[PDB]
Design a protein around this ligand. Structure first.
Ligand SMILES: *[C@@H]1O[C@H](CO)[C@@H](O[C@@H]2O[C@H](CO)[C@@H](O[C@@H]3O[C@H](CO)[C@@H](O)[C@H](O[C@H]4O[C@H](CO)[C@@H](O)[C@H](O)[C@@H]4O)[C@@H]3O)[C@H](O)[C@H]2NC(C)=O)[C@H](O)[C@H]1NC(C)=O
Ligand SMILES: *[C@@H]1O[C@H](CO)[C@@H](O)[C@H](O)[C@H]1NC(C)=O
Ligand SMILES: *[C@@H]1O[C@H](CO)[C@@H](O)[C@H](O)[C@H]1NC(C)=O
Lengths: 97, 97, 49, 48, 49, 114, 49
């Protein structure tokens, strides 16, 4: 209906061409809200899933606490992580910012 | 059809048919290639969610660059967008060990 | 064809299956392997009308 | 929509059946790919 | 959307652990293609009969 | 090489759940894998510690190995199955002290009884 | 084959014994595996059955 009432958005409009050329674009298996639901629940699992042996249990620990274990596990000692917790959070925030 | 009679009309229509059949075959072949490609790629995304997002990876260069700490995933127009947060060292010094 | 253009060696491509193999590769030197070649054609031994 | 062309198109065998089936299969593959991927991203447990 | 088990975080030095009290075994079946049917064609016969 | 000849620690690579063992048989155009996984059920929520320290000796601290310290005072459970058992030197490791570890002053587990 | 460090040696141990090591290695304690050996074998058998 949009391509009849308003018409092509521009030259070479490949969406309005569907009903002219004889082809159809099909919708995806999932809508936007469902896809978002999957990545949202994935986000909430990161801190408590990546932590210890086995995939069967979940440790609902603070994200920050998870990061300090992730850093300790790669060679940064706990004395350093303890002294620099605010520095680490700031650098992390800069990386995402 | 407006201009020619059957003995010549068929020949002209047949040119358009062969051209259009060729186009459709080429289109389908590329959709099959692109589809297969995406399907392989979907497996790769699966591996990265399980390896980089739900876990800390010890694989150099698999997730991001540097030492992997944590990854996040959001949806993208035709797939997933990964944000791999890595630890990047600087100011190396030499010591005796 | 030799450098001087004369034909000194040739293959009759329809003689046998090995000859068919050399002709399909346009070469007197082909690699070892197991190759499909033209089927042995059945010929009519008569006709019905 | 021209009947004369359709008559000639039939001489190429079941051409459109092959086009439609190939794309149908490709489109199903895409849905299976998505269903499989999201089944694996899905967490069993998560924090709010 | 099938929601995951929700496990809240604690505002304390403790954490909430969601741990199984039962289990089962299950079999995930998977098929991996390794080959395709090998085919050769007698091209000359196919085309010209 | 990853699932049949070895136990995999890769989530979702072999089957679903936690991989235990896989078997392979031939299939018409390939191989058929049967991945036996461990699937948890009936999860419960318990309160856990990140570690335990001797209140009288704050630098003497322990953390669980492949499991958790849970309240019941403190006991150990394996990470994949709730089954509280005493905290012993076989299910703990000594660690540097942390602000998130609990200060235990009474019924201390054996690893902390200096 | 799946048992210890290195790919060079082979420990011809009972299948059942291997399974209990596989389970211990994922977080099920030995006290549990010892108490439930018949339960575990039964659940395993159901999964394959
Ligand atoms: C179990 O016992 C332990 C040991 O007593 C206890 O952990 C300690 O808690 C105190 C706080 O009560 C920590 O001391 C400070 O806490 C403040 C918090 O704002 C920090 O900012 C301080 O850091 C500065 O000072 C440090 C030197 O003291 C510097 O190194 C640092 O760079 C900052 O300038 C400081 O951390 C104390 O550090 C911890 N101990 C350890 C080993 O972390 C724990 O809380 C008790 N458990 C429970 C459940 O109560
Ligand atoms: C409770 O949460 C608030 C933030 O909402 C925080 O400032 C406060 O310190 C927390 N209390 C404790 C005991 O951690
Ligand atoms: C575990 O679950 C099974 C069903 O899958 C049930 O028959 C069995 O009684 C349960 N065991 C316990 C201890 O809940």
């Amino acid at each position: 209906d949009d391509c009849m009432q308003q018409g092509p958005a521009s030259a070479r409009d490949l969406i309005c061409a569907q009903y002219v050329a004889g082809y159809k674009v099909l919708p995806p298996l999932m809508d936007v809200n469902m896809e978002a639901a999957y990545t949202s629940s994935l986000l909430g699992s990161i801190a408590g899933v990546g932590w210890t042996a086995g995939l069967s249990s979940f440790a609902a620990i603070p994200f920050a606490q998870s990061i300090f274990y992730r850093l300790n596990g790669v060679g940064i000692t706990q004395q350093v992580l303890s002294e620099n917790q605010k520095l680490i959070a700031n650098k992390f925030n800069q990386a995402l910012g | 059809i407006q201009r020619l009679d059957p003995p010549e009309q068929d020949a002209q229509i047949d040119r358009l048919i062969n051209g259009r059949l060729t186009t459709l075959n080429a289109f389908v072949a590329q959709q099959l290639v692109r589809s297969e490609s995406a399907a392989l790629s979907a497996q790769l995304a699966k591996d990265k969610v399980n390896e980089c997002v739900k876990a800390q990876s010890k694989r150099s260069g698999f997730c991001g660059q540097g030492t992997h700490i944590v990854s996040f995933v959001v949806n993208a127009p035709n797939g997933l967008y990964f944000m791999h947060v890595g630890y990047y060292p600087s100011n190396h010094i030499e010591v005796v060990s | 064809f030799s450098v001087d253009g004369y034909i000194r060696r040739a293959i009759d491509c329809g003689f046998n299956d090995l000859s068919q193999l050399h002709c399909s590769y346009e070469s007197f030197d082909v690699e070892s392997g197991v190759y499909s070649v033209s089927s042995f054609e059945a010929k009519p031994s008569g006709s019905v009308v | 929509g021209f009947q004369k062309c359709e008559q000639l198109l039939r001489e190429y065998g079941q051409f459109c059946s092959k086009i439609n089936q190939a794309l149908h299969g490709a489109n199903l593959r895409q849905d299976d790919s998505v269903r499989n991927l999201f089944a694996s991203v899905k967490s069993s447990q998560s924090s709010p | 959307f099938n929601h995951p088990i929700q496990v809240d975080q604690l505002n304390s030095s403790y954490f909430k652990l969601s741990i199984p009290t039962n289990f089962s075994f299950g079999v995930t079946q998977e098929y991996i293609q390794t080959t395709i049917q090998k085919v050769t064609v007698d091209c000359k016969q196919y085309v010209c009969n | 090489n990853e699932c049949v000849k070895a136990q995999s620690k890769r989530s979702g690579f072999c089957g679903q759940g936690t991989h235990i063992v896989s078997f392979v048989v031939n299939a018409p155009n390939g191989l058929y894998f049967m991945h036996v996984g461990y699937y948890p059920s009936n999860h419960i929520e318990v309160v856990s510690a990140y570690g335990l320290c001797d209140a009288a000796n704050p630098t003497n601290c322990i953390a669980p190995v492949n499991g958790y310290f849970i309240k019941t005072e403190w006991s150990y459970t394996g990470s994949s199955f709730y089954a509280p058992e005493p905290i012993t030197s076989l299910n703990t490791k000594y660690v540097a002290p942390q602000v998130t570890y609990q200060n235990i002053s009474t019924n201390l587990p054996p690893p902390l009884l200096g």
